[PDB]
Amino acid sequence: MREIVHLQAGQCGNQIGAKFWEVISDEHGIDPTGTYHGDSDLQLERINVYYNEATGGKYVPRAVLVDLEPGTMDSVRSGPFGQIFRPDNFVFGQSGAGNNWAKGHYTEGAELVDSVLDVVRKEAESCDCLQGFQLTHSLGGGTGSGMGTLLISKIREEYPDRIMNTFSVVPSPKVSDTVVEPYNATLSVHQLVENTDETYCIDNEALYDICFRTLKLTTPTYGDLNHLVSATMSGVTTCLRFPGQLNADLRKLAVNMVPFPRLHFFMPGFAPLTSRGSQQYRALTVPELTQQMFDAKNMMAACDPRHGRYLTVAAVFRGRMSMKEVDEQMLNVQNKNSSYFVEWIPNNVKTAVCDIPPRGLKMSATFIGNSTAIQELFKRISEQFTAMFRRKAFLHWYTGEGMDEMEFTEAESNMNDLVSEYQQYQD
Amino acid sequence: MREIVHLQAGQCGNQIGAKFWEVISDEHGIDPTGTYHGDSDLQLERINVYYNEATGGKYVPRAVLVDLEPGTMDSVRSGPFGQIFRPDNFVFGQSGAGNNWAKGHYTEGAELVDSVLDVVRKEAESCDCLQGFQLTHSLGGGTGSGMGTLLISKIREEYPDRIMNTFSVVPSPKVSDTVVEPYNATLSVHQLVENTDETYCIDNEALYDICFRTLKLTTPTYGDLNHLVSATMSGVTTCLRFPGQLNADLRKLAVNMVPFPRLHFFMPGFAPLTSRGSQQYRALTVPELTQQMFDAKNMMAACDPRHGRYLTVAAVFRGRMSMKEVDEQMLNVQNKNSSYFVEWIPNNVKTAVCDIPPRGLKMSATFIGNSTAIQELFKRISEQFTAMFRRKAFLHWYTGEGMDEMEFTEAESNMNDLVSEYQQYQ
Amino acid sequence: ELTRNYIAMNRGAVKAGLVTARENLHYRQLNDIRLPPNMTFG
Amino acid sequence: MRECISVHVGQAGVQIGNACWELYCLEHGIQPDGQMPDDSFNTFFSETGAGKHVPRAVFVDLEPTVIDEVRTGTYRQLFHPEQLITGKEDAANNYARGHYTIGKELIDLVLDRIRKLADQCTGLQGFLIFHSFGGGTGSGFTSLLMERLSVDYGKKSKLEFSIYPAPQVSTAVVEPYNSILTTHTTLEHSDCAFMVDNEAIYDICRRNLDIERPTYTNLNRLIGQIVSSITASLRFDGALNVDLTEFQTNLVPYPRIHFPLATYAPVISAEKAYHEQLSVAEITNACFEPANQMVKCDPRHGKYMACCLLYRGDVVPKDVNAAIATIKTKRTIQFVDWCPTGFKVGINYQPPTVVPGGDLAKVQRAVCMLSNTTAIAEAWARLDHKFDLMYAKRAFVHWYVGEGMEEGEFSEAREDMAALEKDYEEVGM
Amino acid sequence: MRECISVHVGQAGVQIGNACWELYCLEHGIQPDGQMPFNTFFSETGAGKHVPRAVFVDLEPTVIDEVRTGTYRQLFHPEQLITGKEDAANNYARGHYTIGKELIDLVLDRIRKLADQCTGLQGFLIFHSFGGGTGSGFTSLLMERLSVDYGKKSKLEFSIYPAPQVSTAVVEPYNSILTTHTTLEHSDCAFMVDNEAIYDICRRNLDIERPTYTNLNRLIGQIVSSITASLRFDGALNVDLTEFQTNLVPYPRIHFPLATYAPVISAEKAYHEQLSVAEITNACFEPANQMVKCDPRHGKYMACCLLYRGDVVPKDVNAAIATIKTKRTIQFVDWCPTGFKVGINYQPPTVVPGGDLAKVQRAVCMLSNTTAIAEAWARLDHKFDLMYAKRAFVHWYVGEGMEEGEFSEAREDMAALEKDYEEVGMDSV
Amino acid sequence: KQKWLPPPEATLRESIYTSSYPRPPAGAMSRREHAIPVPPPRLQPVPHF
Ligand SMILES: Nc1nc2c(ncn2[C@@H]2O[C@H](COP(=O)(O)OP(=O)(O)OP(=O)(O)O)[C@@H](O)[C@H]2O)c(=O)[nH]1
Ligand SMILES: Nc1nc2c(ncn2[C@@H]2O[C@H](COP(=O)(O)OP(=O)(O)OP(=O)(O)O)[C@@H](O)[C@H]2O)c(=O)[nH]1
């Protein structure tokens, strides 16, 4: 009955929640109409940590889907699992930040935040006790990033003690889809580090490989890729929803992983991934799961663990499984390559185990790790943004919208501090 | 056997009555003709309150419909539920008031009060214990603003113990319909400050906002606006018509809502008001009923209470299960929001309960509130009146029918007084 | 005019009893309200 | 022989009376019509000589919409129609309306029915008054009743059972006026007055029973079990019988202080009482925990000055005396120095009767204490702090003064309790 | 007989004193007017105007004018309240070499008058800051003089030590080091008390978020009431004022005891509990209740005056004091086997009408001295190095009358104090 | 499913007196086990005076 409120920001966030709230509904047993046609009692007991109770059985979800354009907020409302979100938990404007952090945070995105806080206060006080907030967005736009960073600074202010999961969609190194991308990325990271407790980095390019090199499709798409992103999010908070042999939460997660109040950028992942040709050909066992857990190819960001060094590493397991084999093998991967693990932390791995896997899975797990491989992610954004800020390019789409020049050079100063914060534990 | 005589005056009042008598005709289950094709027996147990009785199962409503011109009354007669009213209780003249309080209160109006007072005597004496009369008007016209107050005066002179309740549609903040509305109102409060035991301020602007922000409704009609007034006109007299756990009549609400004498303006508000596509997504529990009946957006008046300080609060809750969540979530409010509740009065909420649920809904609630924020209503009415009396605008009309200019100033006085009288108790 | 107190005004009226409304206006107007010399030392 | 007439005044007294007479109709074998389908009923029920047992009670209220329910529902043919007294308009939360202007037209009907009951009765022991301080007819008409009940019956016992208005929560706003004005009038016209609360029976139902969101009927089922245990030994055989006159002789030291509390011990739901032993020592320890008394006052602030213990069913005197000796030893519970014994135990053999549709299990051992404390003085000071500060600028007195009272009545009602706020610490020192 | 003269210099001292003179008053029993409805802290004129024994001093007016117009203005006879024209700027140079001279004659003459009306002074009580100007200069003058004038009479001094990171003036660092080199050889005992730590005591314990200055002062009030309660009221093992110095100051230049009250409870948590004499003790040696921020662990203990108060038996103390010795944590030094002086008065800790303190019936005011004030000394010394490194804010102190060498003299002096609160603790061989 | 799916809902228009206080069962009535039998008449004031 510890409560999680989910927030969507922008076209990226709405499509994530469009592909996440179907996973939980097909796992808990909620139909497109909201009525609980489950198969067991051990899905309904914690239906509280998600979908809220309304008469008739309707388990209406608890998610503030926000967007500054009336475009994608409709795609969800009109789709497989669309008639489930309260027809008012949808706050949609009409203008559109237009890929600009400025008018999404200061002028046009600051008129809609009163309409969101009126909704957030409405459904976060009806719960018995709030465990914390969570939000998914992209750093690459002006709506998910601009108004997402303003909303995250507000909901931290009135509720300081709550835990906060944010799943940022960081830029891709090789192929970018926005010319003003390192402007919306760096100035979002500044608003992200003092207002979050834990942050997962999601990459568009890194998940293109998995659906081609691991899942092996010639036509991977956003729908085929947001299911992977929604898989780990349904894979993180399982012990809040289901029992198990070693139960955790979003806080036993949080304490073991981030050591210092700035170094909270983690490595999301999903273990049991293989192609549809290796369907009945593969034993879904722990040596076939933990070996692929720590591989760089199964990572939901553009980071390589081989160039950096881990600080803390973590996993939650699902299904009916003994775990001497995830206490020996997680110790082996901790010990077989000590070059990639930090020396001054004696035990780097945490373990937690649930009892229910997702439907269609027999035994699953997800990945999380604090690493100094987020260093190459942030310095790549840093080298890309300082290379354009020296020639004063695209500033008048950031200056004429009520934003001073000074928070631009404070934005690089904060991130240059954070890259140096990961420099001291490189070796 | 307590009974409430209805007195609808003016076009606005004859359209608020059209809906009230149709709403109270369902609550009890009376069809247009006048018979009872209902179901429960707790529906014909207390029909005496807002219904008489004639041949067989006829239940002719106890209402004296009034209008200076005979057009609005005619519309009613020839409407859906118009063959229910007694043709004689329809008192209308021939000429009107032309939006002139003067005419309604001095000229064409004191030439009708006699015939209206005759019927309100034949429908009051024709009953035993009368809880009190009741009027529905629109301060901002002529019949409803003048005759309305002329009647409200000559009924307190003969029956000076019955409860004079009035549901007045005060001039809106911005929304302006009649141009000589500042005057009519400013000259019709001095009477409603000393000749009523419980007046309600139901501005039309607030009504549109609850039919736009709360009850998402693209095209609000005057029927929707009238429904929101009738719904909050059946909850205040609900524990007199249906069994209850903690009963509450129309006096046991004044007694515990009018702090000192003068102050008697109340801001009404309903509770289970949700949209149509958002009707099956909200659990109707007591928590999710107080949250809305105290939220300022719901207030059926245009004086957000945040700007003021509730001197008293009521809550005629209607529904079954409601005896621990009710109080626990009624002290809660007085505890969180603690600056919007005076300190010179300890407890500030009058809880009540009617175990009969409004058809359809499982639970409803009506909040009669006496915030000192109503001091804004009068303030705007005065800022505007004073702007026209300065450059004597329209005065000719009023001064002609028969009215010294002293009366106008005397009015600004009584009003400005009420505002300061309120300010002190705040 | 020094305004009105309105606190002792309503208090002072209800001493005699001004329950009904129309009688209270009459009492609204008529009740208009706005070292030792020698000692020792030492 | 051992009759007592219960006078139920107010809608609080009606809903109390409906639950009290529902329990009594199952305790004694009186089905809701009135005819049995062995002589323990004279205390509460009469006889017509044809099986028609008529309850020895009057239901009086100024408002008809609550008394017409029992005139229509299940217990319609049980009550004599003239024992159900109704008016035409309520007092509307006013002491003065109930005492002066509208209570005067029914009190001669009420005392006519009381005289008819009293003349029918031979060994009349004590009247029982059920009302609430926060109401209008529960505080005004109730006060006017005893002023003329006392002259017609003299030193006859008058056990009060009033709903004290709630300390921290409330349901009315003018109820401090209704709470000060009646305890001046009923102070010299009541031998014992049992203080009970809404919010302190309410806390019992939420944590000590499993039933959350209870109604007035769930409170009144507990109310019925108290007054059943209060008048338990008067009807059934017992080892140590207590009379109605046994209560005031052993609980009130001075006539000015006659306010014992009430506490029912084995209030445990059907599933939870099946899972725990209910020994006499285990249930007498529940009566002294602070969260089981039905007035929200902590006895740690006050001092116990008299206690009257009641017992039902399979209790033995050996277990009772060891239980009384144990509770004396604990220092968290303090008796006053001039009260070295402070106990009155009464044992009835009959176990309490379960009600189909109740919130209690089949129990064999029950306790009903009446323990007045010094800790009621904080209830007066809190209720006077929300009165004198509220009376500082004559807040709601226009609904009281010129419609049948004076301003000087308020000046002497609070000052009388100022003497009562001075009386209780004279005990404490 | 036993007499003590109190001088309140600087807004700090004066304000803390308004608290002390309200506390000391209610205790003895004199209405603010100083009339009752010789006392080791008050005197007595014929008529009966029990006058006080204090000389409030402050170059700047205001502060003391509020004392000459407030409710407590009919006491401190005019002559006592000595103000000044103005020029009370944060400058030791302006309070000991400039706008101080033109008042030291008056203040000293009054100290003389009260000493003549006295009959056995046991010492003086100077209330001062430790990081301003009048309280970092005018006080050095007062001490420099009293030393010669009133020769040797335990001059005890209460102080508000600069915080570890919550200060006000930017010059604070300087003033303190320049008020040590002087008030280190003239003051027989200086009970240092911070302001940061007292805020936490009113956050973690008193649970009164928003501590003002009125509250932080009331704390120093009850502490100074204890230090000076063994002179006015009776009590068993009583202390005096000449022995505090012989029972706390190890070597000559180590006279800086800390302070810790024991039962700091709020008016909302005494539902029935009463921390015993074994709890208050184990609560004062807690690394958090210390009223001065200085982890009593990073340093050994050298002495401790566990003065108690209220109902306290002379045995519970013994057991407790011993219990404390056991705890490995509390590490007393080698050259102090005993190191646990005690004391017990009978007057129960008084209650300021409207304070945030309840009526506790026992309190220990520990006046210990640990080799842990070294950290606070080291802190202010570094907080001075940077400022002096670039002769900051020296242009001012050099103009009001001083040299650029007094700074290095005070530095060598404060450096020694560090080495003293060090060699004193390196054990022995 | 009893609070998900509503009752047959003929009890929409019924007061709290009707639902909370039904007719008790004839077999749920309590027998007076520990009482005095009336076939020996109780001690009444036989002096009628
Ligand atoms: N404990 C308890 N109190 C009740 C119950 N029913 C009503 N009350 C009390 O009744 C008080 C309100 O006064 P009412 O009884 O409703 O009014 P009244 O005494 O009939 O007087 P009038 O206002 O003239 O009708 C509340 O404060 C309740 O404490 C009940 O079932 N149990
Ligand atoms: N606890 C407490 N500390 C105070 C109070 N008033 C002043 N202080 C302390 O005193 C310091 C400043 O006041 P002082 O140093 O006494 O001022 P001064 O001695 O008169 O010197 P000038 O400011 O130059 O006049 C502040 O840093 C506070 O820490 C008070 O009321 N309570």
Ligand SMILES: Nc1nc2c(ncn2[C@@H]2O[C@H](COP(=O)(O)OP(=O)(O)O)[C@@H](O)[C@H]2O)c(=O)[nH]1
């Ligand atoms: N993983 C994933 N990323 C998406 C999806 N849709 C958009 N994005 C990312 O979002 C970026 C563009 O963001 P944008 O639409 O401007 O965000 P907005 O400002 O909130 O509207 C692209 O670079 C994509 O990488 C999706 O369905 N899945």
Ligand SMILES: Nc1nc2c(ncn2[C@@H]2O[C@H](COP(=O)(O)OP(=O)(O)O)[C@@H](O)[C@H]2O)c(=O)[nH]1
């Ligand atoms: N709320 C509400 N207000 C109405 C309705 N019909 C009319 N009004 C208001 O009533 C006012 C007109 O009153 P009017 O006809 O001049 O009164 P009369 O001339 O004396 O009969 C307008 O300002 C409208 O705003 C209605 O159905 N509902």
Ligand SMILES: [Mg+2]
């Ligand atoms: Mg009533």
Ligand SMILES: [Mg+2]
């Ligand atoms: Mg100063």
